[PDB]
Amino acid sequence: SPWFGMDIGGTLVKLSYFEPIDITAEEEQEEVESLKSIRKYLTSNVAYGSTGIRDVHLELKDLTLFGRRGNLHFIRFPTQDLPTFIQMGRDTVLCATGGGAYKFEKDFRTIGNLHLHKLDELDCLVKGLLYIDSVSFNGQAECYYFANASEPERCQKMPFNLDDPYPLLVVNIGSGVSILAVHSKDNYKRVTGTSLGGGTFLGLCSLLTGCESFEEALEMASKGDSTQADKLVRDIYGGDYERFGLPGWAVASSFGNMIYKEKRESVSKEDLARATLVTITNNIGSVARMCAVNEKINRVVFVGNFLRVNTLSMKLLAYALDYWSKGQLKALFLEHEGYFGAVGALLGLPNF
Amino acid sequence: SPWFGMDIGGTLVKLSYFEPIDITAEEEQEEVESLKSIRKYLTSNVAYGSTGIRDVHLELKDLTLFGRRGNLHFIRFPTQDLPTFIQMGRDTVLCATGGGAYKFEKDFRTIGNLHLHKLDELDCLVKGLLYIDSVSFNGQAECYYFANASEPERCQKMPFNLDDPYPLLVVNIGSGVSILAVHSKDNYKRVTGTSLGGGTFLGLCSLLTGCESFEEALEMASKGDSTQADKLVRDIYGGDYERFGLPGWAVASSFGNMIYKEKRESVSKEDLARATLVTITNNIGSVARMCAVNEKINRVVFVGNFLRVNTLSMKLLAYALDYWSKGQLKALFLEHEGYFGAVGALLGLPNF
Numbered sequence A, B: 001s002p003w004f005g006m007d008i009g010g011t012l013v014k015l016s017y018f019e020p021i022d023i024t025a026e027e028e029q030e031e032v033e034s035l036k037s038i039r040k041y042l043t044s045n046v047a048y049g050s051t052g053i054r055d056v057h058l059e060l061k062d063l064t065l066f067g068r069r070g071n072l073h074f075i076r077f078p079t080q081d082l083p084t085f086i087q088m089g090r091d092t093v094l095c096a097t098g099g100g101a102y103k104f105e106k107d108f109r110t111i112g113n114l115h116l117h118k119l120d121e122l123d124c125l126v127k128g129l130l131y132i133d134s135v136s137f138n139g140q141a142e143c144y145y146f147a148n149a150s151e152p153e154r155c156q157k158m159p160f161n162l163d164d165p166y167p168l169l170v171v172n173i174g175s176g177v178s179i180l181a182v183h184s185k186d187n188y189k190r191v192t193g194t195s196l197g198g199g200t201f202l203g204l205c206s207l208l209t210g211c212e213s214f215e216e217a218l219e220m221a222s223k224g225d226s227t228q229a230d231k232l233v234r235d236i237y238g239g240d241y242e243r244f245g246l247p248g249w250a251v252a253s254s255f256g257n258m259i260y261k262e263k264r265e266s267v268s269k270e271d272l273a274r275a276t277l278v279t280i281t282n283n284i285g286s287v288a289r290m291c292a293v294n295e296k297i298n299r300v301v302f303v304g305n306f307l308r309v310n311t312l313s314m315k316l317l318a319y320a321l322d323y324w325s326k327g328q329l330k331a332l333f334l335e336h337e338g339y340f341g342a343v344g345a346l347l348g349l350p351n352f
């Protein structure tokens, strides 16, 4: 049986796969050809079908897991294409997490003799996050922050140490947003959540701009000016609102300038894409800040695939969290952003 | 000099006007004709120009203020039309608040010999709110809640007593959102705010549906089905997420179903209008709940003109705040929702 970990979310399926690299002579002979064929298919291709992608740059090499040396691979594809994955599989013990482990439980059992073990979404997230950080990213730090995020001339990616991680606030930006307070390896709760996450950015941006992919919406947002759509504090006061420390550049009303017909007619798609990203990102950071104050936690780590190849949101979160907390909260990020549930599911394998 | 109070916000100008009803014989003769003309223009018309509206139903009659009996009138018009108001005025001491008191200060001084006194936006809000509640709404309660908001068969408007108001959380839903913790009549702070307020609803709904007015967007939203655009918990899990008490009907990702091209092509404008309202309203209630927990305040009062003629948002806030706090927080509303700053400004008149 191959060692898989699967996180089936609302938008993306994430898969962690452990490739043994210490296969002896007798072990190779005992291999069934279908197992040799699966391992060869996964390691010789980086694109699977039309929508499966292996993130090669995230691979953990020479990892000791369950007493064996191997490489840990990270693979993703849209949940919309899970029926194709299952039909491929019908041509093994599967630890699965995310909402789709329950929604698609009966579909996985169409694969004969397959043993599906459902694991809690946020239980695997914590276990996966603490494991990857503990084994490091091939000797490098798994966690990083943006030093001097208030100054763009100095704002640069710098590694961050989480050797004693607790207490920790985890902000999981997937389709929606889950916010976790991690007090120890076995003591953690879901503080709250918000429904304004990656799916809101993607869904709204698709309505407003007609973009056809997450990467395309990010590309449009990088060329736009969100202030063409948003109403700023200085549009209401003429400048700063000194009494309550609100700078003129702060957004008073997201999309607030779109109440005027002439401004809707002069706004571009790139402006709307950017305003969507800024609106979603600032609201996530603001909610994260409120939970951090309530939980008395000053380390806020952001995960989930809303932030993959999305440096704009990361810098925005880094600047905003630092500015609005007056340097008392630090925005932290992790190289394996969206795969921690898949890893945590894989780690539940010995329990069966 | 007529007694005006003016709150010039980002979207709407609010005006409170005190009409003396105890004018003696000698007082009437000493009246200048322009003062008789202004008083007659305001009390004999309910529509001023093309965009000014007097909310007759809110009028406080036989009010004793500054030692005189009179009626308190409530008038509104768009800030976009303030130049017309000023040009009418150029054909008096003015206490003004809101961001526009600073942005348009030089324009008000084009009226000769006019004395403009700027007052803090949230200072007038608190003073105005506590005053209107103290004098009551013509013998009726100014404050009301929705009893049994969890059950639609019993959900009905019921008056609420605020005779000892403190402590109080005030959630001012204007263009953006301001959240205030009121600890006493002179001790209060702005806890935080969010940029997802009435202007976001109006601005986004205009982009998505082409609606031309706030009332039209509310009319569209009442006919729509927000679940056509939003991704629910049961769309991800297949049902409830029992582990963390998330019901299947809860919104996991606002506009999250708009990532699929076929769902964008079958969604209606009414659905998008409703999803915009639900998204904005739930986020406001969720932020209000987080501030209430942090401030240890269980009375949350919502004001601002996002909720005028908007019972859908009020019931939504009443149900959501009660559900997610398990009955520990009460959503409260006030009949004079958007006029408290204008009233508070009027009350600063003796200080000059």
Ligand SMILES: Nc1ncnc2c1ncn2[C@@H]1O[C@H](COP(=O)(O)OP(=O)(O)NP(=O)(O)O)[C@@H](O)[C@H]1O
Pocket (backbone or CB within 6 Å): A008, A009, A010, A011, A012, A013, A098, A099, A173, A174, A175, A176, A177, A197, A198, A199, A200, A201, A202, A214, A303, A304, A305, A306, A307, A308, A338, B236, B252
């Ligand atoms: N290739 C991609 N396709 C789709 N969305 C992408 C892609 N890359 C990044 N994203 C973003 O990542 C978000 C989903 O991230 P992810 O953490 O995988 O959520 P999820 O687990 O699938 N949904 P959830 O059930 O809430 O956990 C989307 O809403 C997008 O904003």
Ligand SMILES: Nc1ncnc2c1ncn2[C@@H]1O[C@H](COP(=O)(O)OP(=O)(O)NP(=O)(O)O)[C@@H](O)[C@H]1O
Pocket (backbone or CB within 6 Å): A236, A252, B008, B009, B010, B011, B012, B013, B098, B099, B173, B174, B175, B176, B177, B197, B198, B199, B200, B201, B202, B214, B303, B304, B305, B306, B307, B308, B338
């Ligand atoms: N006739 C109307 N015209 C415009 N907006 C309306 C109207 N009726 C209700 N609204 C809503 O009320 C919101 C503005 O309420 P209001 O409390 O007056 O904010 P404001 O003071 O003008 N802006 P702010 O500077 O943030 O205080 C708008 O964003 C709409 O959602």
Ligand SMILES: CC(C)c1ccc(CC(=O)N2CCN(c3ccc(C#N)cn3)CC2)cc1
Pocket (backbone or CB within 6 Å): A233, A236, A246, A250, A251, A252, A253, A282, A283, A284, A285, A286, A289, A317, A320, A321, A322, A324, B099, B175, B176, B177, B178, B192, B193, B194, B195
């Ligand atoms: C007074 C009226 C006009 C008004 C002004 C401003 C606002 C909005 C507001 O007050 N703010 C914006 C959002 N802010 C953030 C943003 C990101 C992070 C992080 N990480 C934390 N906070 C808080 C302040 C409404 C109405």
Ligand SMILES: CC(C)c1ccc(CC(=O)N2CCN(c3ccc(C#N)cn3)CC2)cc1
Pocket (backbone or CB within 6 Å): A099, A175, A176, A177, A178, A192, A193, A194, A195, B233, B236, B246, B250, B251, B252, B253, B282, B283, B284, B285, B286, B289, B317, B320, B321, B322, B324
């Ligand atoms: C686990 C993933 C799929 C997920 C589920 C759910 C959510 C959203 C969420 O968790 N919630 C919705 C917003 N909620 C509100 C709404 C109104 C009020 C008030 N007044 C208070 N809370 C909190 C819970 C994200 C990701």
Ligand SMILES: [Mg+2]
Pocket (backbone or CB within 6 Å): A007, A009, A010, A098, A174, A175, A341
């Ligand atoms: Mg997920």
Ligand SMILES: [Mg+2]
Pocket (backbone or CB within 6 Å): B007, B009, B010, B098, B174, B175, B341
């Ligand atoms: Mg206002």
